[PDB]
Design an enzyme around this catalytic site. Structure first.
Site, short mmCIF file in Angstrom:
data_model
loop_
_atom_site.label_atom_id
_atom_site.label_comp_id
_atom_site.label_asym_id
_atom_site.label_seq_id
_atom_site.Cartn_x
_atom_site.Cartn_y
_atom_site.Cartn_z
N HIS A 18 7.95 21.47 30.83
CA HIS A 18 9.19 21.93 30.11
C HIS A 18 9.76 23.09 31.46
O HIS A 18 11.17 21.98 31.33
CB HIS A 18 8.66 22.65 28.98
N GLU A 19 9.23 23.52 31.44
CA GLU A 19 9.94 24.26 33.49
C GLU A 19 10.29 23.89 34.00
O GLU A 19 11.76 23.43 34.66
CB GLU A 19 8.51 25.61 33.41
N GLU A 60 17.90 23.44 25.68
CA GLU A 60 16.69 23.28 24.91
C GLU A 60 15.52 21.96 24.49
O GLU A 60 14.91 21.53 24.38
CB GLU A 60 16.40 24.74 24.29
N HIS A 102 13.14 22.22 33.16
CA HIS A 102 14.94 22.53 32.97
C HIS A 102 15.20 23.01 34.30
O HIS A 102 16.47 22.65 34.88
CB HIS A 102 14.11 24.30 33.19
ZN LIG Z 1 13.25 26.20 27.38
#
Ligand SMILES: [Zn+2]
EC number: 3.4.24.69
Length: 421
Positions: free
Chosen positions: A222-223, A261, A226
């Site tokens: 997830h990171e 997000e 980003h």
């Molecule tokens: Zn996030």
């Protein structure tokens, strides 16, 4: 990506992949032992008291201002054994991510996403932005500035507050102008979150929802997603947030979620973005890539004693997937930009990773987390690159038992439940 050697925290510096370094910060920082686990990617097995000036100590905030979804402990990452375990945990998660085709592709996009060299007041001059490098002590002793795209570092005061942050330049929003910037991820492989899930297989619910834990590899991914957006300068402004709620009357009802997000999480949720809105940004970032292409076409010199102008022009040609004619002039392919954009924003999502990993995960980014657990991913009998906690040839390999905090209770130590709210 794949880590060639099995680093040990005790291994002596060699300048090559193990060195003492300093981060570009307005604070008197001392050097820390760091590890280059792959080209352009480093790991700093230390609590992050370097990046944020107003976060130089692991001191927790007033109990009142303490958000329910938080946790403190100043003993974490204080010993060499812990740093070694951390290092090995991060390395193992990168391998788990890389072990998948999706993970392999993301890591490759991350490695090639070198932040653009737009640090000069002179438009025809290519210059590296200092905050996209680290200072590395060379074998002889002195410091030398080196470029990198990603640094994985332990968390600051709030141990479970994971994130992807970077240093800003000046009037340029590096993470949203196509330039990109070096990303610093506060993350820990030693803790994970709990969430409820109903795997009911009959008509009516009896036993109820089981208590499961998030696979750390999903959180890292997830990171990294980003980071992927940020390194390519296509992150969505954080002031772009969506409102969600069941009986939302009017004017801010139910917690809000940013476009960044949601996009990152993906899933049915990501569809909460009209094709128009999705096409507006696509166009917006298409023009930014065009400005980059135009900057590179007008470039006549380059600063530094590192690379040549032609080399860097090639480097950015590969990153932005720019079109080049016979005279060597660059241009942005409208169709190729669509491909790369879709990849970074629609293919690399937490949802798709969950699918490739075949693990159980929260169904919505909005799906609250129950509690926090202490884990140990290093030991092969507890977790593996290919199965995670759901070890094949064992009972853990059934019904996501490995992630079941009740069943595999020996691999999950609860610390604090989020009661307040
Ligand atoms: Zn996030």
């Amino acid at each position: 990506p794949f880590v060639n050697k099995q680093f040990n925290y005790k291994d002596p510096v060699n300048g090559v992949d193990i060195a003492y370094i300093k981060i570009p910060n307005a604070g008197q920082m001392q050097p820390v032992k760091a590890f280059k686990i792959h080209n352009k990617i480093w790991v700093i097995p230390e609590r992050d008291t370097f990046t944020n000036p107003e976060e130089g100590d692991l001191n927790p905030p007033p109990e009142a201002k303490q958000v329910p979804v938080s946790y403190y402990d100043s003993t974490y990452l204080s010993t060499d054994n812990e740093k070694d375990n951390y290092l090995k945990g991060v390395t193992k998660l990168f391998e788990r991510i890389y072990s998948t085709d999706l993970g392999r592709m993301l890591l490759t996009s991350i490695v090639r996403g070198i932040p653009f060299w737009g640090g000069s007041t002179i438009d025809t001059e290519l210059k590296v932005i200092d905050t996209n490098c680290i200072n590395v002590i060379q074998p002889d002793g002195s410091y030398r500035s080196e470029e990198l795209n990603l640094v994985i570092i332990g968390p600051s005061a709030d141990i479970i507050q994971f994130e992807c942050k970077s240093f800003g330049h000046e009037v340029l929003n590096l993470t949203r102008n196509g330039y990109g910037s070096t990303q610093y991820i506060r993350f820990s492989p030693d803790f994970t979150f709990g969430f409820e899930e109903s795997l009911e297989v009959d008509t009516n619910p009896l036993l109820g929802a089981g208590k499961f834990a998030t696979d750390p590899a999903v959180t890292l991914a997830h990171e990294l997603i980003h980071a992927g957006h940020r390194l390519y300068g296509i992150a969505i402004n954080p002031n772009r947030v969506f409102k969600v709620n069941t009986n939302a009357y009017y004017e801010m009802s139910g917690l809000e979620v940013s476009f960044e997000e949601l996009r990152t999480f993906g899933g049915h949720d990501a569809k909460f973005i009209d094709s128009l809105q999705e096409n507006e940004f696509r166009l917006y970032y298409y023009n930014k890539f065009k400005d980059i292409a135009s900057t590179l076409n007008k470039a006549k010199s380059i600063v530094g004693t590192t690379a040549s102008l032609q080399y860097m022009k090639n480097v950015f040609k590969e990153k932005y997937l720019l079109s080049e004619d016979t005279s060597g002039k660059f241009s942005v392919d409208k169709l190729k930009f669509d491909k790369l954009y879709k990849m970074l924003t629609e293919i690399y999502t937490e949802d798709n990773f969950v699918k490739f990993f075949k693990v159980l995960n929260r169904k919505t980014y909005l799906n609250f987390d129950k509690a926090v657990f202490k884990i140990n991913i290093v030991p092969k009998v507890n977790y593996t690159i290919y199965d995670g906690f759901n070890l094949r040839n064992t009972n853990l390999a059934a019904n996501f038992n490995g992630q079941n905090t009740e069943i595999n209770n020996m691999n999950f130590t609860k610390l604090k439940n989020f009661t307040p709210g």
